[PDB]
Design a protein around this ligand. Structure first.
Ligand code: FMN
Ligand code: FMN
Lengths: 350, 350
């Protein structure tokens, strides 16, 4: 942890996970101010909006923070497949007096397909830039490192970690099956090894090269200590920060995570088009069930789901929301983010 | 921290997992003599054979050991379903010039359906009796405890752990998704939460009452230390002991676990009829695929598979073997069991 904190310029080996739709400049700044590494996610925003968000964080903290971008294979539009998916969803929209959207859009541009993102990052120079779903080309990773920036990439397997090493990243974020949100699997069509945090962190620390940031299921200082025993250099925690008042989780999401539903999470591909973990609801169904048409590509599926979420929310219905949560959800606490960071550090010290 | 060792009268908080077909009286005795808790599995044997196995262990050690029994819901014979399954397997049998069996047998009697097991255990009184796939009724757990036996039950979720506490067991074995072999899910028809070790151990230790024995993915002292930081009172390790000379793993299994195949494990229900983790081969296929008929009950499916294994083996083919292994398989070591136990203790102490 001394090595990692020195590398990142921070006091504590704790990253508050970037969480699209949940992390905020206020949350990131609170964690960075408290001594960890706060994070924001800027995928889905135009580069100049991402720039504004980065500048917002800087107006709230002097300390290092992490800017996260999705690096998936660029989605492949398929109007016919998307049409059939929308037709399939039509009765759900109709419950709320709505029709499905007339077309789906590539709402989350990959780092690999939006050439305006890299130069913006090279200008703003956040302390850390992180990638999910894949690693950028080595030359782009090097460009970021050429200015101040530390580069992290998420991996879910030793094979993916090898690719992160090849990309020249400064650290690998080892995401275990416990983790909330969309899984960082590079090529899900090849399957999902679905490796638990305890095995994955040990495997990458033992037979790997880079500092390992443990992600998935860690909710308290005991979990941080366990990750460190396995050989991690730091932890990345998402679910633990969702209930912070600084996050942009809405009231229904906070209520869900605080209550009995927190007892069980599940994986779904039907929410976004990519395997993701959260509190199961009506958007969690079997994609291989009879009558269910072929799934469109990521992220077009999520565009469809967001339209349905909008229609449901317009009638006060939250049963289609994306309430992401890891397998430690039952251990969630509701605290100001700075207090949570401090509490984690006290628990880590023992 | 001495919570489990004092409970069992042993020196080290390390259980060598019971492993049907792999653990032996010699393996159990080596581990118990070295200061841990050695284990044998006696399901699939008549009670008097089970008794003989227990006496074999006692012939080799005076120290505490663990005797394990399956406690699944008893399988229901279904000739039509079984005939359909055998028909589906028929071309595999034919590949090796064999016929499938005419009938499938209930080869592994549950503790719940063989009334001769409890009286035998009450007479022999091993230090620990453990159960997998379910908890016995409270009155039977009490009967065992009444003569000084410590009762352990495996759970894969907090809900199953609650049933273990209701049954009045002395300890819960928290089996995470990392674990090798058959998963201890009580009611797999309800689905499988598939909780990773790091989350599961923390959940049971943070929110439950019983001492927690961490099982799944633990291969070295760092892993043991990690489990203790999560709040476990001991660990249970299967895969780590498979390569010990004292085990009854055959040569193909040992070579498989030592070789490149150890880099990947997966789950299959088509081998035994219950979800199980091992090194994938031809018995690892999607049971929900088009053209695949309904699975017979556990353990009838395993009877079918064993017949196929026999036929394949006769032609020198090992691609249908049950080579169980957890997600830490790449970290397996080959040592005399007593030497492995000493190494683990050295690593644990730091
Ligand atoms: C609500 C939510 C949103 C998330 N959003 C992102 C994201 O936008 N980008 C990313 O790389 N990871 C995201 N993650 C995953 C985290 O980076 C991390 O893998 C995960 O939170 C660790 O598991 P935990 O929730 O048990 O701490 C998200 C996780 C959650 C729960
Ligand atoms: C080959 C093998 C056989 C096993 N047999 C049994 C068994 O007969 N009864 C039981 O309760 N658990 C059995 N287990 C599971 C262990 O009790 C334990 O949950 C598991 O080994 C822990 O995961 P690990 O292999 O990563 O250490 C077996 C595991 C393996 C790998």
């Amino acid at each position: 942890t001394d090595r990692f904190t020195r590398l990142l310029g921070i006091q504590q080996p704790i990253i508050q996970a970037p969480m699209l739709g949940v992390s905020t400049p206020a949350l990131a700044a609170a964690v960075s101010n408290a001594g960890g590494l706060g994070s924001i996610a800027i995928t889905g925003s135009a580069a100049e909006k991402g720039r504004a968000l980065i500048r917002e964080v800087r107006g709230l903290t002097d300390k290092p923070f992490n800017v996260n971008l999705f690096c998936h294979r660029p989605g492949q539009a398929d109007p016919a497949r998307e049409r059939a998916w929308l037709d399939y969803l039509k009765p759900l929209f109709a419950e709320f007096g709505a029709e499905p959207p007339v077309r789906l859009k590539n709402i989350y541009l990959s780092f690999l397909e939006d050439p305006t993102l890299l130069p913006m990052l090279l200008e703003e120079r956040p302390a850390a830039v992180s990638f999910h779903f894949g690693a950028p080309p080595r030359d782009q990773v090097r460009a970021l490192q050429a200015v101040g920036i530390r580069v992290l990439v998420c991996a879910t397997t030793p094979e993916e970690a090898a690719l992160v090493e090849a990309a020249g990243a400064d650290a690998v974020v080892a995401q275990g099956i416990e983790a909330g949100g969309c899984r960082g699997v590079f090529e899900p069509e090849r399957g999902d090894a679905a490796i638990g945090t305890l095995a994955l962190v040990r495997l990458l620390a033992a037979r790997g090269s880079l500092p390992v940031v443990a992600a998935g299921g860690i909710m308290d200082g005991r979990g941080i200590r366990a990750a460190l025993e396995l050989g991690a250099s730091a932890v990345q925690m998402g679910t633990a920060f969702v209930l912070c008042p600084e996050s942009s989780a809405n009231a229904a999401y906070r209520e869900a995570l605080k209550g009995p539903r927190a007892a069980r999470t599940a994986l779904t591909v039907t929410m976004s088009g990519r395997s993701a973990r959260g509190l199961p609801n009506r958007m969690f169904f079997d994609a291989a069930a009879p009558g269910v048409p072929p799934l469109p590509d990521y992220p077009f599926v999520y565009d469809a789901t967001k339209a349905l979420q909008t229609a449901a929310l317009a009638r006060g219905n939250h049963d289609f929301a994306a309430q992401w949560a890891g397998q430690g959800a039952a251990l969630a606490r509701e605290l100001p983010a700075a207090e949570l960071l401090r509490t984690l550090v006290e628990e880590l010290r023992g």
